[PDB]
Amino acid sequence: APSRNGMVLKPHFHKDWQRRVATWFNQPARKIRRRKARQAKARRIAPRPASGPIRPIVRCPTVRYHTKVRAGRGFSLEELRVAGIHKKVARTIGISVDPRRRNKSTESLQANVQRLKEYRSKLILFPRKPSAPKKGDSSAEELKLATQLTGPVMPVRNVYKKEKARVITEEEKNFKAFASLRMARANARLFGIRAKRAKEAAEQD
Amino acid sequence: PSRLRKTRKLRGHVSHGHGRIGKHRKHPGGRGNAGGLHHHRINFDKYHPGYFGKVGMKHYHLKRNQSFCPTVNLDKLWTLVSEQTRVNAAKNKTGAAPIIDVVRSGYYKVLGKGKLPKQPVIVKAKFFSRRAEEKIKSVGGACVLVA
Amino acid sequence: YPMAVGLNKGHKVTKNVSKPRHSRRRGRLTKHTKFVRDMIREVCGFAPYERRAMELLKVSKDKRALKFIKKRVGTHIRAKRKREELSNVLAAMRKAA
RNA sequence: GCAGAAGGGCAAAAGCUCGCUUGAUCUUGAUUUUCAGUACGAAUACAGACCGUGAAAGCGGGGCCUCACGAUCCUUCUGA
RNA sequence: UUUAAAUGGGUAAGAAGCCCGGCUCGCUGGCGUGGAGCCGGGGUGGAAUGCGAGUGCCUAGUGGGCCACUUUUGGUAAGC
RNA sequence: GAAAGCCGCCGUGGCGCAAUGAAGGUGAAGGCCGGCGCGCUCGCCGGCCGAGGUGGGAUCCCGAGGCCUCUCCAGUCCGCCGAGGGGCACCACCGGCCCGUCUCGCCCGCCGCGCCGGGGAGGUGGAGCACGAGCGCACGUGUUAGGACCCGAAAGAUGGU
RNA sequence: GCCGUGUCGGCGGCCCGGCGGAUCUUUCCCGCCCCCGGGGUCGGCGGGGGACCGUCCCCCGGACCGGCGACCGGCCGCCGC
RNA sequence: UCAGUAACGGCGAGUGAACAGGGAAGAGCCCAGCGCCGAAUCCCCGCCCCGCGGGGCGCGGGACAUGUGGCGUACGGAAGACCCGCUCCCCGGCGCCGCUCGUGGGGGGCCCAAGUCCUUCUGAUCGAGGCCCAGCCCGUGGACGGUGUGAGGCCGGUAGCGGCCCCCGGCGCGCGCCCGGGUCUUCCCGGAGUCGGGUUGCUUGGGAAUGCAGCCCAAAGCGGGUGGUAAACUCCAUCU
Ligand SMILES: [Mg+2]
Ligand SMILES: [Mg+2]
Ligand SMILES: [Mg+2]
């Protein structure tokens, strides 16, 4: 069955696969079924923003992706605690809440508090009949538009710094080299062994 | 295109391009990679040497994110910034060298590749090779390391 | 001079101090619950393996006692914890008399 | 005569007797034979160590040469 | 088996060849020895006949053969 | 119109742009000039540059000389040109570089002087480097897996009458 | 009357011009961190501003061709009436 | 997408996931326990407030239930007492008005223009023709039926065409329900023949056992589970 210089191959067709076949013939039909499920969901709700609540700034895990910024799930009660809004009030203000999320850094904590107060300062509420607590006159003169598009406060905006130009000085052109990588990597794995021989000379008397 | 193929041209001829003697049936050598050590052995060496056996250590559940480091070597290093930077770098004021950080360009390690130009840089990478950083320290540049 | 590999790894941030999440204080003894388990182990008593254990734990030896508790209660981290609270009954039976 | 089946080879010898020895060791490639010009096996010429013998040149990394043997998977021992 | 054909097999019949000058070497070693290598310079018409070659990829069919000179094996011989 | 059109802070991702090792990991630029340390079989500082060298090599460039109704004076052109030059792709060869291992060796470094890091010179193993050629789409041939060019058993299994 | 291409200039339109830049400006403008009610560029943060460079929109001069981009004048030679 | 990858496999033929990442969609909660409230709770029957198209909050009797109904409470903590500065709400039912983004749904019946002149034919929908207004209509030149090939003869098709009948989701009079937040102080704080272990089966890519199941043994409470090589020690992370 094999021949001249070729590829040794494993087609996974040793199983009755013509019954379990999937053809995407309804796929234009479902694209105009979930546009009409977005349009008849936009006009059904309110002047409330389409594509739902405000999402947080979130950094990705796992070395490959930890230099980018992603839209997250909720707002991690500590960030709701500092911003001053209540946890059961917040999801009818338009603010997503994920109670199982942890804040253990401070800079990424203060980023989303700045984000959450910037949202509250660009929000207009409607009283049912015009009582308006925490709210004043005509609704920002009818709120300048109707409904937003694919993100209320532009959820990614992954930004990079300027770091314009520097002068190649001493102690910078001279030290932080490949020897610093090799010695720091070796002391990372010779740490527990060297702390064992130190015990052996501590029980030496 | 059924028009352009061999079976329209081969219709009228008896064995249909397969021979009176051999008379192509279904599976005369077995199905797939059958007999790879026995009767198809001379095919599997001379074209796939290495195909049979254990060769290393097993690592259960590897994650293709722990080992992720892309590389850029030094010829592709000045294209990470504009060409408007390096023409502005060398026009005789002071030792003002630009930054080139490969991490916001999506690279982690800087390898060596000759003809890094005469200007100084400060290059912010996660890792360096020793051929790479001594090309940089010979154009008057610096090699600053980032986590 | 921060770097990725070595012994002080990672980008340097500053830690957020926080009172820990309430789910983590789950198996604490909570003195009324201490009262319920300590009252009910004298109306009910000891299991047959841990009466044989504490009559090996007073006379026979201790390496053979835990070898008997290794087999019946499952693991080693469970066998020592059982062996030390049978010894605290055996100490309270004899030395508190 | 050279252990033996044959053939080739061999005379201050490759035989016979004696004297020391362990090169029947450690390691990388190349090549020949079978051949697809693949493998094992066998062989050849080296190279680098460490050795033996001899006064020395040298010879020796098994048997005077042509035969005497065995993959993957698994087991086992050895090595830094 | 001393001797030993006919047919046959290999190689050679130039410029990648020849000569001269110099210099590198950790190889070799009485020696400006030996041998390799490198650079530079000098002289092209070097058996007959015929012919355009060189090179890579992809590749089907085939893997039962049969006969006749001459040469030969088994067999009494055979359209064996 | 189940089409077509657009997005680009929708390029995430795929393949390619870098290889090698079981792995920890490491990871592809050289030559000259001028000097110096025992110019010590080894090297060091500064400049010039910059993919090395040899043999072939289409094309191109130069080209003495050569070719015209009367002789000495000047112009474009074109054909013939021995010779010489820079040499494409590519082939053969030599050198070089990176990784794995081997042997022999000496030197340098300090977020800390160590059963620490780095370097050297020779030899071998690699699907490498030596100024990138890939990607997407379409077609054709080939091989394979699928009922697989068409038809064909003796069977085996499950559930029933 | 005309547009093609280098060369600019009027920096003109840049503040009543488009876009692009991992160019610059720690003296601009907004909510903050670093110390003794105030303050130090005292190093920046989030954003806006306006310089510079790269390319495209006019005006005067200048360069060539007026190229299948053309009309009028005169010329030559046709053409039907 | 990862990825035909890690991994499994007479390591042969073959098999073969996940986590990041980009999207589609996005919504969160309740209980037993532990405490508190005179069982503050529920079901049935009888006559009524008063009703359409029938279900109730009101009244009176029989049961349920303390072996525990209901309220407030749920691990993101909770409750109570303080103190501090706010605030009077939500829900359905009834009547009708005002809409409904393709312009809400269902149903019926309606809506442009040659059958003109000549001509061929069994029969025309054929062929020719309609002044310098292009013979007529066109938001209608889809389709089909009519003695043959029809924009105009006829259903229709076009059009935010018109009128009809029934039905739906949503404003505003009467019922029904109604103190939240912060700071401090004290008290409270959890699911067992289950986890786990051994062994045997089946299963998985899961490999010194991924999952499941039988049998045996069987917990703890700074505990337990997980951290992809069996085990001991140790630290950390994470979940409950
Ligand atoms: Mg065939
Ligand atoms: Mg064929
Ligand atoms: Mg059967």
CA distances from A71 to A111, A150, A198 (A): 13, 12, 49
- CA dist C60 and C93 (Å) reads 17
CA distances from A42 to A38, A47, A148 (A): 6, 8, 10
Q: How far away is chain C from the Cα of B1, in angstroms, using its nearest Cα?
A: 57
- CA dist A30 and B60 (Å) reads 40
* Identity of the residue numbered B6: K
The reply to whether residue C15 touches residue A103, judged by beta carbons under 8 angstroms, is: no
CA distances from A13 to A34, B28, B30, B32, B147 (A): 34, 20, 16, 11, 46
Q: Does C29 touch chain A (CB under 8 A)?
A: no
> Does residue B48 lie within 7 Å of nucleic acid chain D, judged by its CB?
no
Size of interface A-B (CB pairs under 8 A): 75
Tokens 């074209």, located at residue: B47
**Within 10 A of C4 (CB to CB), how many other CB atoms are there?**
19
Nearest in space to B128 (alpha carbons), one of A162, A140, A180: A180
Q: How far away is chain B from the Cα of C5, in angstroms, using its nearest Cα?
A: 8
Nearest in space to A59 (alpha carbons), one of C9, B80, B64, C10: C10
> The dihedral of CA A98, A99, A103, A104: what is its sign?
negative
**Within 10 A of A96 (CB to CB), how many other CB atoms are there?**
16
User: Which of B133, B134, B146 is the best substitution to test chain A (most A C-beta atoms within 10 A)?
Assistant: B133
Separation in Å: H184 C1' and A59 CA? 36
> Helix or strand or coil: residue C15?
strand
β-pairing verdict for A69-71 and A57-59: antiparallel
β-pairing verdict for B71-73 and B109-111: parallel
- CA dist B107 and B101 (Å) reads 9
Helix axes A191-200, A178-189, angle to 10 degrees: 50
**Within 10 A of B77 (CB to CB), how many other CB atoms are there?**
24
Beta partners for residue A69, in sequence order:
A59
Considering only CB atoms, B94 lies closest to which of A64, A167, A172, namely A167
Tokens of A155: 């959820």
Name the nucleotide with the smallest C1'–CA separation from A117.
G31
Q: On chain E, which bases lie within 7 A of the protein's CB atoms?
A: 58-64
Residues 6+ apart with CB under 8 A from A91: A53, A97
Considering only CB atoms, A185 lies closest to which of C5, C13, C15, namely C5
**Within 10 A of B1 (CB to CB), how many other CB atoms are there?**
4
Nearest in space to A168 (alpha carbons), one of B94, B129, C3, B83: B94
Q: Does C10 touch chain B (CB under 8 A)?
A: yes
CA distances from B45 to A11, A29, B56, B109 (A): 22, 52, 20, 38
Please tell me what DSSP assigns to residue C20: P
- CA dist B46 and B26 (Å) reads 27
Do A111 and A118 meet the contact criterion of CB atoms below 8 Å apart? no
- CA dist C15 and C24 (Å) reads 19
- CA dist A35 and A97 (Å) reads 27
> The dihedral of CA A39, A42, A47, A51: what is its sign?
negative
Exposure of C88 by Cβ count < 10 A (0-12 exposed, 13-18 middle, 19+ buried)? Answer: exposed
> Helix or strand or coil: residue C53?
coil
Separation in Å: F19 C1' and A178 CA? 20
Do B103 and B126 meet the contact criterion of CB atoms below 8 Å apart? yes
Do A147 and A50 meet the contact criterion of CB atoms below 8 Å apart? yes
Rg of chain A taking only CA atoms, in angstroms: 29
DSSP character string of chain A: ---SS--------SS--SSS----SSHHHHHHHHHHHHHHHHHHH-SSPTT-SBPPEEE--TTTSTTSEEE-S---THHHHHHT--TTTGGGTTB---TT----BSHHHHHHHHHHHHHHTT-----SSS--TT--SSTTTTTSSS---S-SS-S----------EE--TTTSSSSSHHHHHHHHHHHHSHHHHHHHHHHTTS--
Residues 6+ apart with CB under 8 A from A133: A127
Do A99 and A87 meet the contact criterion of CB atoms below 8 Å apart? yes
Beta partners for residue B110, in sequence order:
B72, B128
Tokens 């003002």, located at residue: B96
First to last CA, chain B: 57
- CA dist C80 and C69 (Å) reads 8
Tell me what percent of chain C is helix, strand and coil, each rounded to the nearest 5: 50, 0, 50
Q: How many CA atoms lie within 13 A of B101 on its CB side?
A: 15
> Does residue B61 lie within 7 Å of nucleic acid chain G, judged by its CB?
no
β-pairing verdict for B122-125 and B99-101: parallel
Spell out the SS3 assignment of chain B: CCCCCHHHHCECECCCCCCCCCCCCCCCCCCCCCCCCCCCHHHHCCCCCCCCCCCCCCCCCCCCCCCCCCEEEHHHHCCCCCHHHHHHHCCCCCCEECEEECCCCCCCEEECCCCCCCCCCEEEECEECHHHHHHHCCCCCEEEECC
Q: Which residue of C has its CA nearest to B125?
A: C3
Do A100 and A72 meet the contact criterion of CB atoms below 8 Å apart? no
Q: What H or E segment, with its residue span, contains residue C37?
A: helix C32-43
Strand arrangement of the beta sheet that strand B109-111 belongs to:
B71-73, B109-111, B127-128
- CA dist A99 and A109 (Å) reads 14
Residues 6+ apart with CB under 8 A from B68: A63, A64, B108
Do A135 and A127 meet the contact criterion of CB atoms below 8 Å apart? yes
- CA dist A191 and A174 (Å) reads 27
- CA dist B125 and B103 (Å) reads 6
Q: How far away is chain C from the Cα of A48, in angstroms, using its nearest Cα?
A: 34
Task: Residue B120: list chain A partners with CB under 8 A.
Answer: 168
Angle C36-C40-C46 from CA coordinates, rounded to 5°: 135
- CA dist A132 and A125 (Å) reads 8
- CA dist A141 and A181 (Å) reads 60
Residues present in chain A in total = 205
Tokens of B52: 């049979």
> The dihedral of CA B47, B53, B57, B60: what is its sign?
positive
The reply to whether residue B147 touches residue C1, judged by beta carbons under 8 angstroms, is: no
